[PDB]
């Protein structure tokens, strides 16, 4: 089969170390050679990112410039019909073929309520789920009924991600960081230092552009 490809989505407002460092460690932990970040927008009916689509795309390219592991796909930022993880992954499966292992990266917090921002059954049909560990969190769904789904799909063997196309859920022992885009925005507006929270090229860019004012 082909080389595993992982997909990493989100709004990245802005991208920061809490998003990047855990994922970078996957190259070492499970032999992941490629991660494609697919940033998205937020539907009009929900709180909007403070930085726009082009600013958030640029900050991600700044953060990713010197990291060969990463590439960026700007489709969800160009699509007019609402974005859905399952919709992205279905297009990916189509574009890559059924012979390519595919994985979606998520945090251990989101895993627990996965069926809520669902299409879960469809996602595990199209790709694997690579879960970035949250020290101290349990592997127990918010909805006690989905515990079965979760337990049937889990794997303790990283090799399954490389030998099958989709269907598995693996908890990677990635480092974790107490950093959040929301607090960084607040600190930037409060004039507090964010030097230890995201890449210098992104922070410098933020200042040049006068973002998060
Ligand atoms: Xe994605
Ligand atoms: Xe990232």
From Swiss-Prot:
Keyword terms:
ATP-binding, NAD, Nucleotide-binding, Nucleotidyltransferase, Pyridine nucleotide biosynthesis, Transferase
- Which biological pathway? Cofactor biosynthesis; NAD(+) biosynthesis; deamido-NAD(+) from nicotinate D-ribonucleotide: step 1/1
What's the name of the protein? Answer: Nicotinate-nucleotide adenylyltransferase
Taxonomic classification: Bacteria, Pseudomonadati, Pseudomonadota, Gammaproteobacteria, Enterobacterales
Name its species: Escherichia coli (strain K12)
What's one Pfam family the UniProt record gives for this protein? Answer: CTP_transf_like
Question: So what does this one do?
Answer: Catalyzes the reversible adenylation of nicotinate mononucleotide (NaMN) to nicotinic acid adenine dinucleotide (NaAD).
Q: Which residues cross the membrane?
A: none
User: Broadest EC class?
Assistant: transferase
């Amino acid at each position: 089969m082909k080389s595993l490809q992982a997909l990493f989505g989100g709004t990245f407002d802005p991208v920061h170390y809490g998003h990047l460092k855990p994922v970078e460690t996957l190259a070492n932990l499970i032999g992941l050679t490629r991660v494609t970040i697919i940033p998205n927008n937020v539907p009009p009916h929900r709180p909007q990112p403070e930085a726009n689509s082009v600013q958030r795309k640029h900050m991600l390219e700044l953060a990713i410039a010197d990291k060969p592991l990463f590439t960026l796909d700007e489709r969800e930022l160009k699509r007019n019909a609402p974005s859905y993880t399952a919709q992205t992954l279905k297009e990916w499966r189509q574009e890559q073929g059924p012979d390519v292992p595919l994985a979606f990266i998520i945090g251990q917090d989101s895993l627990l309520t996965f069926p809520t921002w669902y299409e879960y059954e469809t996602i595990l049909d199209n790709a694997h789920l690579i879960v970035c560990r949250r020290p101290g969190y349990p592997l127990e769904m918010a909805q006690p009924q989905y515990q079965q789904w979760l337990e049937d799909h889990l794997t303790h063997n990283p090799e399954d991600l490389h030998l099958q196309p989709a269907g598995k859920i693996y908890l990677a022992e990635t480092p974790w960081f107490n950093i959040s885009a929301t607090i960084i925005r607040e600190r930037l507006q409060n004039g507090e230092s964010c030097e230890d929270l995201l890449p210098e090229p992104v922070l410098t860019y933020i200042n040049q552009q006068g973002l998060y004012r």
